[PDB]
Amino acid sequence: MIWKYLQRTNRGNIIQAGLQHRKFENLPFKQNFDNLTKAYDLRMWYISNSPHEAKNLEYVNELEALHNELNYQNSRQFLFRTVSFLLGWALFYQFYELPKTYDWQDTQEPKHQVPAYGDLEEGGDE
Amino acid sequence: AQTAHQNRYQGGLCYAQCNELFSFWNPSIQQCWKGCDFGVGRVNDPEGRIEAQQMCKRWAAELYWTYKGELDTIKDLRVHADMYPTTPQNVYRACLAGVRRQKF
Amino acid sequence: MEPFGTDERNWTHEEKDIITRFLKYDKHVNLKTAEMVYSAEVESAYFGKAGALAGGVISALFFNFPIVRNLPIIRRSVIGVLPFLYCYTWGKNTQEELRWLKTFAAYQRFVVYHGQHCKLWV
Amino acid sequence: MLATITPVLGAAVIMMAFDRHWQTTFFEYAYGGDPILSQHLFWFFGHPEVYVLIIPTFGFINMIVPHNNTRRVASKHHMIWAIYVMAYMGYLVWGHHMYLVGLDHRSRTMYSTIT
Amino acid sequence: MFRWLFLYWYNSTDTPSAIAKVNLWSYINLRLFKARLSSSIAYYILGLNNLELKKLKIFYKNTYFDYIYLKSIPCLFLIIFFTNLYLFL
Amino acid sequence: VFHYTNFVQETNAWWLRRVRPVYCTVLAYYGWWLYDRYYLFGKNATQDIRKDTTEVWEKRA
Amino acid sequence: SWAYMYPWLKFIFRKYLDVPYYWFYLNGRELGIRVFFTDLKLFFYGITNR
Amino acid sequence: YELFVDHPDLAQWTGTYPKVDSSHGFPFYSTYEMYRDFQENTLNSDGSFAQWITLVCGIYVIHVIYNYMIPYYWVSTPLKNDEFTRLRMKDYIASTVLEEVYGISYAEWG
Amino acid sequence: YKTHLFSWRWFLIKLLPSVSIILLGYYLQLTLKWNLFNKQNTIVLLITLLLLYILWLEFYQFYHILSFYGNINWAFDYDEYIWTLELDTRRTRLANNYI
Amino acid sequence: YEAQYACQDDMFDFLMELAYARRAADNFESDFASHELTTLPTFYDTPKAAERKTYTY
Amino acid sequence: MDNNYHFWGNGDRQDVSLSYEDYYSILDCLLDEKLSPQGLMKFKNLHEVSMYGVSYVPLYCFPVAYGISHMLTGKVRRGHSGYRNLFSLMSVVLPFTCWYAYTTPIPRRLYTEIICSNNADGAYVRNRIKQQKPGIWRKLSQQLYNKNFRFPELNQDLTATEFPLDYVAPHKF
Amino acid sequence: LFLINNYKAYKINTFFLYIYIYLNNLNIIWYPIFKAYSIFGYYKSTRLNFIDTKNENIKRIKY
Amino acid sequence: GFETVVPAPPTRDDELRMIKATEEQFLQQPRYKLYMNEAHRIAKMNHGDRHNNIRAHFWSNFALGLLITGPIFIIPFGKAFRNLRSGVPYYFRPKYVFTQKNQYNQDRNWGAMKKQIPLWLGLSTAYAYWFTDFSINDDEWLEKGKVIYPHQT
Amino acid sequence: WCAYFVPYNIFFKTHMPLEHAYDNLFFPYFQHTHFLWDNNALHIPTVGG
Ligand SMILES: CCCCCCCCCCCCCCCCCC(=O)OC[C@H](COP(=O)([O-])OCC(O)COP(=O)([O-])OC[C@@H](COC(=O)CCCCCCCCCCCCCCCCC)OC(=O)CCCCCCCCCCCCCCCCC)OC(=O)CCCCCCCCCCCCCCCCC
Ligand SMILES: CCCCCCCCCCCCCCCCCC(=O)OC[C@H](COP(=O)([O-])OCC(O)COP(=O)([O-])OC[C@@H](COC(=O)CCCCCCCCCCCCCCCCC)OC(=O)CCCCCCCCCCCCCCCCC)OC(=O)CCCCCCCCCCCCCCCCC
Ligand SMILES: CCCCCCCCCCCCCCCCCC(=O)OC[C@H](COP(=O)([O-])OCC(O)COP(=O)([O-])OC[C@@H](COC(=O)CCCCCCCCCCCCCCCCC)OC(=O)CCCCCCCCCCCCCCCCC)OC(=O)CCCCCCCCCCCCCCCCC
Ligand SMILES: CCCCCCCCCCCCCCCCCC(=O)OC[C@H](COP(=O)([O-])OCC(O)COP(=O)([O-])OC[C@@H](COC(=O)CCCCCCCCCCCCCCCCC)OC(=O)CCCCCCCCCCCCCCCCC)OC(=O)CCCCCCCCCCCCCCCCC
Numbered sequence A: 001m002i003w004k005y006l007q008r009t010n011r012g013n014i015i016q017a018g019l020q021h022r023k024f025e026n027l028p029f030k031q032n033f034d035n036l037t038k039a040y041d042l043r044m045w046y047i048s049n050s051p052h053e054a055k056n057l058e059y060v061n062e063l064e065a066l067h068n069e070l071n072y073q074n075s076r077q078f079l080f081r082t083v084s085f086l087l088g089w090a091l092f093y094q095f096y097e098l099p100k101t102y103d104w105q106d107t108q109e110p111k112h113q114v115p116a117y118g119d120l121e122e123g124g125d126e
Numbered sequence B: 001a002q003t004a005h006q007n008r009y010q011g012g013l014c015y016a017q018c019n020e021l022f023s024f025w026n027p028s029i030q031q032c033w034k035g036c037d038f039g040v041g042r043v044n045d046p047e048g049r050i051e052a053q054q055m056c057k058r059w060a061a062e063l064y065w066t067y068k069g070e071l072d073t074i075k076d077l078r079v080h081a082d083m084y085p086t087t088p089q090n091v092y093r094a095c096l097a098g099v100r101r102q103k104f
Numbered sequence C: 001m002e003p004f005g006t007d008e009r010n011w012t013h014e015e016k017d018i019i020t021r022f023l024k025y026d027k028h029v030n031l032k033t034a035e036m037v038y039s040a041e042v043e044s045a046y047f048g049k050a051g052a053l054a055g056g057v058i059s060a061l062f063f064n065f066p067i068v069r070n071l072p073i074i075r076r077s078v079i080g081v082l083p084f085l086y087c088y089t090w091g092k093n094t095q096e097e098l099r100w101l102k103t104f105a106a107y108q109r110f111v112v113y114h115g116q117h118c119k120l121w122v
Numbered sequence D: 001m002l003a004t005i006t007p008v009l010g011a012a013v014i015m016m017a018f019d020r021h022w023q024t025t026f027f028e029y030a031y032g033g034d035p036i037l038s039q040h041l042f043w044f045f046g047h048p049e050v051y052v053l054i055i056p057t058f059g060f061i062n063m064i065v066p067h068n069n070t071r072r073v074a075s076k077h078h079m080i081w082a083i084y085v086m087a088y089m090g091y092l093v094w095g096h097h098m099y100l101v102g103l104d105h106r107s108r109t110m111y112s113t114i115t
Numbered sequence E: 001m002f003r004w005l006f007l008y009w010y011n012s013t014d015t016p017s018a019i020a021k022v023n024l025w026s027y028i029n030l031r032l033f034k035a036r037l038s039s040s041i042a043y044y045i046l047g048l049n050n051l052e053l054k055k056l057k058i059f060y061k062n063t064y065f066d067y068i069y070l071k072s073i074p075c076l077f078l079i080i081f082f083t084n085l086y087l088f089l
Numbered sequence F: 001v002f003h004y005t006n007f008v009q010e011t012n013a014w015w016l017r018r019v020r021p022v023y024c025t026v027l028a029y030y031g032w033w034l035y036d037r038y039y040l041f042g043k044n045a046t047q048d049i050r051k052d053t054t055e056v057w058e059k060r061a
Numbered sequence G: 001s002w003a004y005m006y007p008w009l010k011f012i013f014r015k016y017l018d019v020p021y022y023w024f025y026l027n028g029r030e031l032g033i034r035v036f037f038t039d040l041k042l043f044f045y046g047i048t049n050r
Numbered sequence H: 001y002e003l004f005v006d007h008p009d010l011a012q013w014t015g016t017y018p019k020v021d022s023s024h025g026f027p028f029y030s031t032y033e034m035y036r037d038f039q040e041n042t043l044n045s046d047g048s049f050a051q052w053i054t055l056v057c058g059i060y061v062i063h064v065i066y067n068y069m070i071p072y073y074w075v076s077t078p079l080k081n082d083e084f085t086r087l088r089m090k091d092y093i094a095s096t097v098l099e100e101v102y103g104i105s106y107a108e109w110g
Numbered sequence I: 001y002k003t004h005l006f007s008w009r010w011f012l013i014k015l016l017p018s019v020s021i022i023l024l025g026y027y028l029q030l031t032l033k034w035n036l037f038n039k040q041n042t043i044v045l046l047i048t049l050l051l052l053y054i055l056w057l058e059f060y061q062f063y064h065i066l067s068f069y070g071n072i073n074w075a076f077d078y079d080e081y082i083w084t085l086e087l088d089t090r091r092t093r094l095a096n097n098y099i
Numbered sequence J: 001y002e003a004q005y006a007c008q009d010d011m012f013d014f015l016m017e018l019a020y021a022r023r024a025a026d027n028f029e030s031d032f033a034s035h036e037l038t039t040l041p042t043f044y045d046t047p048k049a050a051e052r053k054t055y056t057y
Numbered sequence K: 001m002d003n004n005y006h007f008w009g010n011g012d013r014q015d016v017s018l019s020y021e022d023y024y025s026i027l028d029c030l031l032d033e034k035l036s037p038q039g040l041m042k043f044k045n046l047h048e049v050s051m052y053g054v055s056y057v058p059l060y061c062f063p064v065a066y067g068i069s070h071m072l073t074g075k076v077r078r079g080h081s082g083y084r085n086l087f088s089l090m091s092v093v094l095p096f097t098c099w100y101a102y103t104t105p106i107p108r109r110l111y112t113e114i115i116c117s118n119n120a121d122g123a124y125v126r127n128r129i130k131q132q133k134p135g136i137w138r139k140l141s142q143q144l145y146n147k148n149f150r151f152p153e154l155n156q157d158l159t160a161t162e163f164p165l166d167y168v169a170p171h172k173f
Numbered sequence L: 001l002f003l004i005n006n007y008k009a010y011k012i013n014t015f016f017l018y019i020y021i022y023l024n025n026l027n028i029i030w031y032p033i034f035k036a037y038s039i040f041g042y043y044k045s046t047r048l049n050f051i052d053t054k055n056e057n058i059k060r061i062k063y
Numbered sequence M: 001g002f003e004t005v006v007p008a009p010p011t012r013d014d015e016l017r018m019i020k021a022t023e024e025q026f027l028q029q030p031r032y033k034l035y036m037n038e039a040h041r042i043a044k045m046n047h048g049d050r051h052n053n054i055r056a057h058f059w060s061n062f063a064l065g066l067l068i069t070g071p072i073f074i075i076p077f078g079k080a081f082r083n084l085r086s087g088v089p090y091y092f093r094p095k096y097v098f099t100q101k102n103q104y105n106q107d108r109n110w111g112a113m114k115k116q117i118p119l120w121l122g123l124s125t126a127y128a129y130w131f132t133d134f135s136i137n138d139d140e141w142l143e144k145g146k147v148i149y150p151h152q153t
Numbered sequence N: 001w002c003a004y005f006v007p008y009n010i011f012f013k014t015h016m017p018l019e020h021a022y023d024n025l026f027f028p029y030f031q032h033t034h035f036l037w038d039n040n041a042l043h044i045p046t047v048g049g
């Protein structure tokens, strides 16, 4: 019965997937990013898979407005999250004891700070 | 350069044996080839082998400055892969190895 | 001549004071290092009081500023003293930073001079 | 070619100016400087410079001869490819001006062979 | 909405001369998106009476990993068998 | 048309199909000969020495 | 602005340069991908323990 | 053909000819000039000799790299064991190139 | 042993202002579609102040780097018991000069 | 004598100044060397070099 | 439990765990003249493994930093359009993830062999870490005591006649 | 299956499912088009499969 | 460690026996294996044989991993491309080229493939490296670099 | 305060660099000097503007 599990493919792996009804059964009463993107995806899929020109063009018109609204929502999200990240970074480095006890050997060049070759550098003349 | 053949392939099995004995970057292969050339026509004779050994002694002495008794007092005459002809003892050992490898 | 790494302990105030006093008044140190430490001290002493005076002036102005003046005394004094606190802490911090940086440079010079670093040689 | 080579000459000349004025010791052997680096950087542009000077001269003849001969030029594609090969192979022969400077025999032989 | 250039240019009623009467030019009627050919090779050959268009479609573009793995199983088994033969050799 | 190829077929196809194989195979055999000569020196020397008789080798020595 | 961080690139990619050719027979080992797949497991265990 | 129809700019960059046929008489709406440098400056085209010379130079440069550049980084610090052997190993491949070694066998030429 | 490794814990804090500026610029670009000039002057002024701060930091670092090459020291003449200012050139690793 | 042959007089003087400084400091390379812990392993680094070496006639 | 437990670069769940930063710090306070050839070979193998491991660490951290940067940017995935912001913000997020990964210690057979060896090399390395790297040695000794390793250098030694040189963290007796 | 159905009614059993559903609902993402052609261009691109059914593509000889 | 007894120099008969042994080894050397005549030739050939055995085992494990991980990971992983996170079925989301995907499920299938194939290969190679043993050609102390001469074998 | 007072005191009233001036550099420690740089006085228009 190995073929029944290897060579037999699930119906969902071949047939086109349907619409997840539970995603739309109950929705919040807020015209928020989730609802806006759900509507955008619905209209986009309908445009992709539909032969009706009259409904697609109006769907395109509505989808442009949906894109603008989603851009506004994303701008708000970006502002809030970026400000929070910057403030958290600043507070972390304000309250974090930065290690100031690293090795300083690199900054020292004993042979260069005090020229080891002395006067022999200038010409030689021996 | 100082061997008897314009290339190592013209030399018989002795050159291949020298190449196997020494590493590819070890220049003692040339001394082993010199030992092969010295032993050509002498290894198959009890006196010829000793004559070839004396030829190796002379070759080492002419290649490097040496004192009387060093080659006689060499402790180990065996040779390893990473032995280089930087001393008369090493040159003599490589030449002896080539003489031993030489068949005809 | 001290532990290095993130897990180590940063310089303490007592340790810094002891090290700077050692550099100032020790015999094994060199005249150039001693002069460096003295110059650090003299050239850093200024900021501590400069910042305090600037903060005092700015706080005197901010006490009579347009909104602080009309605010009640409880809010007025607290708001008007903020510039003074900021300037005072800035002056003290910059004084300490300059003095400690130059003293640490002098300590490095001393360590190199006496060969007390395991990875430094001519 | 000029676009490819100009930054190298600019960097070399800037390093020369820094050595002269600030004494950066880029070309001072005492503390890591490489006097031969200056020659390398200069000639890397210098040979393409002379190639740039010469290459345009061929076009004058290549245009004039057909015009006066009332005939198409001979193997225009091959001439174009030859000038291109010269242009983009002159970047590996800058050391023929530095044979005797003391560079390694490997680089010397490569430069001579490409030249 | 046209797929073929000849059908697109045969009878055009939205030309600038016709549209100038109403003086309305919608953005949805751009020549850039007006026509677009299919992605499959199509070439003309001489027929019995006129040129005829033949389409050269070689392979599909919607195969899935399950089918690919089923087709690849024999190659994997052959690799394993050859490796085992080498080991036993 | 779909068959328009960006290749200059004037004598190039014939060259690549007739002249290229000959000298390319000659070069391949020459390179293989060099590789074998350089890397299998011991085997070649042993085969050469075993091809001939002991007496002739003694005469050559 | 990251111009002066080239020492880290050098520290990473100089140890790759110093590796000799495999068939020169100096160490006869190549553990790049092996070390990659082993360090995946090692980091998993380390994070879980931490 | 799919590349030409969908992404004409990439087709032109790669050097593909217009794959559509205009036998019907109406020219295509995305035709472009042919950029044939890749297919012309090749060993199989008019740039055959230039590409042969460039290939020879590239092989020579690759050999030079393999002998002189990569080995230079193998050893950069003092070595405790067999330092001289390990240095000579890398020096041999560079100092023994046939370029400046071969020729004595045919010295009679000069 | 001269590896010249700088601490990332120190590098990130220095790098913060530039990423802050670029993020604010992107936000301004995105919001320009539905905002007015007067409202966005806040973001413009914030970007300007951050740019001024970064300019001051860059200038301070550049001034330190350029002043390195002037080696000024105090030398104590014991016979006169006087400190004198002396100027001299610098010798260091060429990597420092290149950077 | 090998170093003298390989070095010109000026470079030899530079190295002699370095040698004088190092001797005055009393510095040995062994007490400063720690790069072996970072150098890659090799067959020559085996803990038994005498056994690693093979001798034959 | 992979099929390469023999491999020196490999490790086990309960093997001694050492961070990359700790390893590099320990490399600083060691001298090769004072180590046996076997110890030198062990250190060379450890460096051979670390050469690849350190370079791979950012590769491991990349997906986490990429996801964090996407979340910071928002709930919109715009592909090439958002690369500028994604990689400008990720240029600081990824260093944080690499910091966490490097601070995270990982077990290794070479680490346990080098630290817990009962020979002169093991004693030397332990004493050097104890003296010149007290901060690292404190954590290392806590880990060893928790993993039931007993050495005279450990601060948690209950049979020692000399007082410890570092604070002893709480632990179960 | 019977055991799962029997335990379905329990609120404690449904708490984990509710948490999973909430996490899934907090996972939405948007995929905008970042090309100038935009939505109309995408629509025209997708319209390939239905052009043959339009009136303008019906055979109608002028003569 | 201790040193063994050094034999006296070989006689002519011993030299001839060594020459014969070297000739036999050279003859036994395979024709298709290109190894240069050097002190490390035999060690290199042994290392190559061990590497070939490891290669065989690794490729067998890789093929087995490709066979196994497919139905277990990649195919179930492709079920995540059935619908978007919003619940709508998969639809094409062009980047810069508005490719025509009229073919049934062309967009979904190609999008799933672009992630499944790299995942398939990565999982297969991880399986191979996990279940393949390198013990045969692993030398922690690098003691297998000792030179072996043809006559010794 | 930020743009004129603090920079003035940190630049002219002290020759000692701040930590952030050189913590990322690998030069040895050294002091500043306003009278041994930019002889052309090209920084005056820059600061003024
Ligand atoms: C993208 C869409 C999806 C489809 C594609 C898939 C994804 C893209 C990548 C695919 C291509 C990868 C490259 C080719 C590999 C296969 C080649 C082949 O079949 O020829 C036989 C060839 C030799 O095989 P073998 O001798 O039998 O060895 C197997 C034995 O078991 C012995 O095992 P071993 O552990 O000892 O390893 C052996 C190997 C080990 O060698 C090494 O040690 C090399 C690696 C060292 C470590 C990495 C260093 C570089 C990266 C540093 C990163 C630094 C980051 C920055 C850090 C700081 C800043 C943050 O050494 C050798 O045997 C000698 C040859 C070494 C050649 C290495 C170079 C290969 C690439 C170049 C030639 C091919 C063209 C590639 C074109 C470009 C592809 C992208 O295969 C190998 O290269 C070795 C096996 C590799 C693993 C299996 C790969 C299966 C293929 C699918 C892999 C899918 C990706 C996941 C793995 C990652 C890539 C490996
Ligand atoms: C390593 C250095 C790294 C530096 C990194 C710097 C990073 C910062 C970069 C900033 C700058 C970016 C912009 C660069 C612009 C450069 C100038 C330019 O052309 O711009 C045009 C650009 C636009 O002007 P345009 O006239 O429209 O440009 C037309 C194109 O450039 C088209 O020009 P074209 O019409 O002249 O086209 C010529 C091309 C056209 O011909 C072709 O199509 C090439 C041939 C293809 C077919 C070959 C087939 C061969 C047969 C098959 C293989 C046989 C071998 C065996 C295998 C097969 C067996 C069957 O053919 C060639 O000349 C190429 C040589 C072909 C030989 C192939 C040999 C292969 C052997 C393999 C080893 C050797 C490989 C060498 C490289 C090969 C080429 C990639 O200029 C501007 O926009 C204004 C100027 C802007 C300047 C900006 C600043 C530049 C700074 C550069 C600094 C460089 C520093 C280092 C220099 C020294 C390096 C050694
Ligand atoms: C009168 C007025 C009244 C007003 C009233 C007003 C009232 C207001 C009320 C309040 C209203 C506001 C309420 C606000 C609520 C806010 C909160 C909220 O709702 O949630 C927001 C928010 C919802 O999400 P979102 O931000 O909206 O974004 C959703 C997007 O859809 C997300 O999109 P995405 O899927 O693209 O996400 C990217 C994602 C992923 O991105 C990626 O990186 C993936 C894709 C990368 C692609 C490019 C690279 C690919 C390279 C190849 C990768 C191959 C795989 C293998 C690689 C190996 C290494 C090479 O990135 C990450 O996850 C990054 C962090 C990863 C952390 C480490 C892994 C965590 C999971 C571990 C699972 C372990 C399972 C063990 C099972 C054991 C079973 C025995 O909540 C969160 O997401 C919170 C997450 C916080 C971080 C959690 C970190 C957990 C770390 C766990 C570590 C465990 C270690 C030990 C494991 C031991 C195992 C044995
Ligand atoms: C003689 C040499 C120069 C000496 C200058 C001395 C200092 C003077 C400072 C004056 C500042 C402006 C004051 C304006 C007040 C009035 C405003 C007004 O009514 O609005 C109208 C209008 C501005 O209208 P607005 O509505 O206020 O504009 C608002 C805009 O947002 C604002 O936009 P905008 O108007 O600025 O637009 C012009 C735009 C175009 O840009 C410019 O205008 C360029 C400005 C360059 C200034 C360079 C100054 C150099 C000298 C410094 C000081 C020298 C020593 C002074 C004495 C010692 C100290 C006391 O400016 C920019 O965007 C520049 C960007 C920032 C660059 C800052 C400077 C460069 C920094 C980086 C490089 C620094 C290092 C050097 C690198 C190069 C090395 C080769 O102003 C004018 O048209 C000019 C003034 C009125 C007309 C002239 C009336 C008098 C007749 C001319 C007498 C002088 C010439 C003839 C002499 C012979 C007579 C017989």
Ligand SMILES: CCCCCCCCCCCCCCCCCC(=O)OC[C@H](COP(=O)([O-])OCC[N+](C)(C)C)OC(=O)CCCCCCCCCCCCCCCCC
Pocket (backbone or CB within 6 Å): F024, F025, F027, F028, F031, H056, H059, H060, H061, H063, H092, H093, H096, H097, H098, H099
């Ligand atoms: C399809 C035909 C194929 C024919 C087979 C040959 C071509 C194979 C593909 C190209 C690579 C050729 C590399 C040859 C050399 C490899 C070894 C090596 O570099 O060392 C030996 C030599 C180096 O020898 P060496 O001096 O290092 O000697 C080593 C030994 N000791 C140390 C003892 C001295 O290589 C060179 O000299 C390279 C010089 C650079 C130019 C080489 C050009 C070769 C001839 C032209 C070939 C063109 C082929 C075109 C094919 C396609 C078109 C038809």
Ligand SMILES: CCCCCCCCCCCCCCCCCC(=O)OC[C@H](COP(=O)([O-])OCC[N+](C)(C)C)OC(=O)CCCCCCCCCCCCCCCCC
Pocket (backbone or CB within 6 Å): C082, C083, I046, I049, I050, I052, I053, I054, I056, I057, I060, N002, N003, N006, N007, N010, N020
């Ligand atoms: C106190 C309450 C009453 C109301 C207060 C009103 C706020 C006044 C804010 C003044 C801002 C001045 C900006 C100066 C820009 C130039 C800085 C420069 O060149 O650096 C010199 C000096 C720095 O010189 P430095 O060389 O010593 O740098 C020190 C470097 N570190 C930090 C690493 C030690 O600047 C500073 O000291 C701080 C500069 C901060 C710049 C921040 C810019 C963006 C934000 C501006 C503030 C916005 C506040 C809005 C109101 C909020 C009210 C709650």
Ligand SMILES: CCCCCCCCCCCCCCCCCC(=O)OC[C@H](COP(=O)([O-])OCC[N+](C)(C)C)OC(=O)CCCCCCCCCCCCCCCCC
Pocket (backbone or CB within 6 Å): D014, D021, D022, I052, I055, I056, I059, I066, I067, I069, I070, N003, N004, N007, N036, N037, N038, N039, N042, N043, N046, N047, N048
């Ligand atoms: C130019 C921009 C557009 C083109 C981009 C490409 C340009 C690339 C140019 C460089 C190429 C590479 C060569 C590098 C040469 C470097 C030379 C060099 O270092 O010279 C520097 C020179 C110094 O050279 P120097 O020769 O005097 O150096 C002294 C060294 N010794 C003693 C050894 C000779 O400095 C200047 O040119 C002056 C710069 C002044 C900058 C002033 C900035 C003021 C900022 C104010 C705002 C901040 C807050 C405070 C505001 C206060 C308001 C009251």
Ligand SMILES: COC1=C(OC)C(=O)C(C/C=C(/C)CC/C=C(\C)CC/C=C(\C)CC/C=C(\C)CC/C=C(\C)CC/C=C(\C)CC/C=C(/C)CCC=C(C)C)=C(C)C1=O
Pocket (backbone or CB within 6 Å): A012, A017, A018, A019, A020, A021, G040, G041, G044, K001, M069, M073, M074, M076, M077, M079, M080, M082, M083, M119, M123, M126, M127, M130
């Ligand atoms: C130390 O540990 C180890 C390692 O180091 C970490 C190793 O590397 C290895 C190496 C070997 C390996 C094989 C690597 C192991 C790697 C692992 C396990 C991680 C990788 C795992 C994966 C890639 C699998 C990921 C896939 C999934 C989780 C499946 C996801 C499936 C989903 C979401 C199903 C979604 C489907 C649906 C909801 C159905 C929708 C159906 C419809 C009809 C649509 C709706 C329609 C209507 C109408 C309602 C080993 C063995 C190891 O043990």
Ligand SMILES: [Cu+2]
Pocket (backbone or CB within 6 Å): D046, D047, D048, D093, D094, D096, D097
């Ligand atoms: Cu020239």
